[PDB]
Amino acid sequence: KMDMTLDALNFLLGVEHLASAFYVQAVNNFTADDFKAAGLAQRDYDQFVGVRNNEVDHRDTLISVIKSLGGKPNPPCKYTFPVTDVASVLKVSRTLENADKPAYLGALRDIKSVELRTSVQGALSGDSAHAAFFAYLTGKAPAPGPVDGPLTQRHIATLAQDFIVSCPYPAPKPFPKLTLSPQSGPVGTVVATTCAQDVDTNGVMCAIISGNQGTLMQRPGQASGAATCTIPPGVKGILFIAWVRGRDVLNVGVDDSSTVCGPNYFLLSALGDAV
Amino acid sequence: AEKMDMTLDALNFLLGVEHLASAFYVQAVNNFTADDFKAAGLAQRDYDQFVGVRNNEVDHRDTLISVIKSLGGKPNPPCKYTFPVTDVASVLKVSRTLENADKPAYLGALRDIKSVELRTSVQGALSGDSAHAAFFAYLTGKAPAPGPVDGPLTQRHIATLAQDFIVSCPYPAPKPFPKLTLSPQSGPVGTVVATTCAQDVDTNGVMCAIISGNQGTLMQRPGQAATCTIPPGVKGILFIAWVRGRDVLNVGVDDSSTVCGPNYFLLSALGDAV
């Protein structure tokens, strides 16, 4: 009980070390003036500082709680962010918040105290508001679906690996990155998938991981010879797509034992996207 | 089995919440067009997302019905509703009010859901309603993400927040407390808020409860213009209630001393329209 709870909280602290490091640097490097030149109003820059403050609060609270439970808080890792202009700041922000929600939803499975679940659920709700904000600012629907779903710790590491240079402690190990082409679109979109590493693809299936219908398994098609996966009807919200071995894992959002490459995110088109 | 009793009671409570929300958005989408939104200074994509909220809330309702039946419970039917809507400004204010109440509804209910798998599902729906609340905040000039932590309220607290939209229920729904009027109902730390209760309760022993997600409940003796002052250290959305006595330290999860309210208070935040 306590072992699993502290392990989940330290994992969450790793997630918030990464997000708070970004927002702190971004606010130090970009001004309200920079935001207005890029299409954003004063209140949008104000909210960006508010996001920074919220994420520093998430980090600090986790540190304090881990210490109060007798644990040893993970230190920050070393990070790198692919930032050029303000549009890239918004894209990085959206990417981080879109990964941190399934991080929280997965971690909450392992937290075995009612009071700690209430605190962590409360921060998840805050991160969901962040994600809606950055969606709206980048022309995406802020609320594209009814349910956000979980991913495992290693899955989150896979989403975050481009930003993490190294960690001084054994952080969750990522899977190879799965490139998706295109990375957004509506139901029926044929998505070409390529893996960053030469994994064995015998028996590899597409896992479409959706908040509202769970894991949907499909045999990959062909495009180059790249594997393809096709977005099925009925999914809503943000999707994660991964290669998995076999189909004995019924719920890949909570079970990475068969994961081979990915997941990566796919921004499903929704009512609310810019027109 | 106690765990399963508590779980079913929480889910049927959330179904009452989602019957109300889905009834609102289904009617509102039927009564407003993109042209209405455009004339009021909004965009096509804002109307599109409004339709998406309706779809999302219909999904929340239908999911709770399916799960309650799968657990052998009997789903609560809809209550009967009325919504004070005549223009775009009112339809957005009602929307924001509903989503601001439905988040602490989910947060309180999750305390009583005793299955890991059902918590994951219900938490995911809470995440969705948090996105709704952010959207309606932004459209009404409020910060979409005003704080780090959203907090819970009890079932009866949520009934209190929703009572103006509920005409009657055909089953014993949570009973509201009298409404607590707040004036002003928004502002920064230090704002002095005049509080008036809809009924003539005994105010001997009554304290102001300031309920925050990041700090819990802050108790304070009411002032005289009854008033409550927004204290330092709070972040995000607040709820203010009258409580009797000082024995309840966490009002968000304990309504045994509540005597009027809560009502919401939109604490100022970075991201408000300037």
Q: What 3 state SS string does B211-266 have?
A: EECCCEEEEECCECCCEEECCCCCCCCEEEEEEECCCCCCHHHCCCCEEEEEEEEE
Q: Are A90 and A26 in contact (CB under 8 A)?
A: no
Q: How far apart are CA A176 and CA A158, in angstroms?
A: 7
* B45 Cβ under 8 Å from any chain A Cβ: yes
The reply to whether B117 and B26 lie within a common domain is: yes
Q: Residue B95 to residues A28, A43, B25, B89, B221: CA-CA distances in angstroms?
A: 36, 21, 8, 10, 33
Residue with tokens 């105010």: B203
Do both B6 and B133 map to the same domain?
A: yes
On whether residue B165 sits in a domain, the answer given is no
Cβ atoms within 10 Å of A53's Cβ, excluding its own: 20
Taking an 8 Å cut-off on Cβ atoms, the answer to whether B103 and A125 are in contact is yes
Q: Which residue range(s) make up the domain with A89?
A: 2-137
Q: How many CA atoms lie within 13 A of A232 on its CB side?
A: 18
Residue type, B247: D
Task: Give whole-number Cα distances, A62 to A101, A213, A223, A274, B34, in Å.
Answer: 16, 31, 45, 36, 43
Question: Do the Cβ atoms of A274 and B111 come within 8 Å?
Answer: no
Picking from A101, A147, A250, A269 by the largest number of B CB atoms within 10 A of its own CB, the best residue to mutate is A147
| B117 is known to lie in a ligand binding site | no
Sheet of B192-197: strand order equals B180-183, B192-197, B227-229
Q: Give the span between the Cα atoms of A260 and B2, in whole angstroms.
A: 41
CATH number for A212: 2.60.40.10
Is A1 near chain B, with CB under 8 Å?
no
Q: Token pair for residue A62?
A: 């986790």
Total residues belonging to chain A: 275
Helix spans in chain B (H)? 2-31, 34-39, 44-70, 88-110, 116-139, 155-162
Beta strands in chain A (DSSP E): 78-79, 164-166, 178-181, 184-185, 190-195, 204-210, 214-218, 221-222, 227-230, 239-245, 259-268
The reply to whether A15 falls in a domain is yes
Measured in degrees and rounded to the nearest 5, phi and psi for residue A172 equal -55, 135
Q: After which residues is chain B broken (C to N over 2.5 A)?
A: 225
* Contact with chain A for residue B176, Cβ under 8 A: no
The count of residues in chain B is: 274
Q: Is B223 on the interface with A (CB under 8 A)?
A: no
**Domains: count for chain B:** 2
For tokens 């970009």, the residue is A30
- Are A54 and B148 inside 8 Å of each other by CB? yes
CB B149 within 8 Å of CB A122? yes
Interchain proximity B131–A142, CB inside 8 Å: yes
Residue B173 phi/psi, 5-degree rounding, is -75, 165
Mark whether B131 and B181 lie in a shared domain.
no
Report yes or no: B241 and B262 within 8 Å, Cβ to Cβ: yes
Gap between the terminal Cα atoms of chain A:
49
B36 near A CB under 8 A? no
Closest residue, chain B, to A148 (C-alpha) = B124
Identify the residue whose tokens are 């209550």: B79
Same domain membership, residue A191 and residue A116 = no
Contact B30, B47 (CB under 8 A): no
CB of A155 within 8 A of CB of A240?
A: yes
Which amino acid is present at B142?
Answer: K
A172-187 burial, b at 16+ Cβ within 10 Å, e below that, comes to bebbbbbbbeeeeeee
Beta partners for residue B219, in sequence order? B209
- The DSSP bridge partners found for residue A239 are A210, A266
Q: A137: how many CB neighbours lie within 10 A of its CB?
A: 23
Closest to B238 in 3D by CA, of B135, B151, B134, B163: B151
The reply to whether A123 and A16 lie within a common domain is yes
Say yes or no: A125 and A182 in one domain: no
- Residue A55 known to bind ligand: yes
Indicate the pairing of strand A259-268 with strand A184-185.
parallel
Q: In 3D, which of A155, A48, A60, A157 has the Cα closest to residue A92?
A: A48
CATH code for the domain in which residue A90 is found:
1.20.1260.10
Do B194 and B68 fall within a single domain?
no
Does B146 lie at the interface with A, CB-CB under 8 angstroms? yes
Look at residue B147 and tell me if it is in a domain: no
| C-alpha to C-alpha distance for B93 and A190, rounded to whole angstroms | 40
The burial class, CB within 10 Å (0-12 / 13-18 / 19+), for A226 is: middle
Distance CA B77, CA B81 (A): 12
B191 in any annotated domain: yes
Please check whether residue B156 lies inside any domain of the structure: no
Cα dist from A220 to A185, A186, A264, A265, B163, whole Å: 18, 18, 16, 17, 52
Nearest 10 degrees: Cα torsion B203, B205, B211, B214: 160
Find out whether A85 and B115 touch, Cβ atoms under 8 Å: no
Dist CA B72 CA A55 (whole Å): 41
Q: Are residues B132 and B261 in the same domain?
A: no
CB pairs under 8 A between A and B: 187
Residues A133 and A186 occupy one common structural domain:
no
Resolution in A: 1.7
The answer to whether A53 faces chain B, any CB pair under 8 Å, is yes
Q: Which residues of A touch B52 (CB under 8 A)?
A: 141, 143-144, 270-272
Q: Do both A132 and A191 map to the same domain?
A: no
Please tell me the distance from the alpha carbon of residue A87 to that of residue A90, in angstroms, as a whole number.
5
